[PDB]
């Protein structure tokens, strides 16, 4: 159960924007915060998330 053992736990990522890993997201309309990004890393995250 790590799903439950991290919650109440806001955490900061940093990346660095170069990479096919963090490549924003494909669309017209740009989202803001973490909804604007896709990628291997960005997907993983939210996997990890
Ligand atoms: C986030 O905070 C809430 C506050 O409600 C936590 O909920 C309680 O968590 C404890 C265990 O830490 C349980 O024993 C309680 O039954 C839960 N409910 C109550 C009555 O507060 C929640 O677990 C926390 N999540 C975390 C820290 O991951
Ligand atoms: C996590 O908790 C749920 C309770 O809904 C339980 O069904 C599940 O088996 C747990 N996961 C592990 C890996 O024990």
């Known amino acids: 159960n790590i799903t439950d053992s991290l919650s ?3 955490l900061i ?3 660095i924007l170069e990479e096919p890993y963090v490549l924003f997201k494909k669309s017209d309309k740009p989202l803001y915060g ?5 990628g291997y890393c ?8």
Request: glycine share 0%; hydrophobic share 30%; aromatic share 6%.
């Open 8 to 10: 109440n736990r806001s």
């Open 13 to 15: 990522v940093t990346t």
């Open 42 to 49: 960005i997907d993983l995250l939210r996997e990890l998330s």
């Open 34 to 38: 973490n909804d604007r990004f896709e």
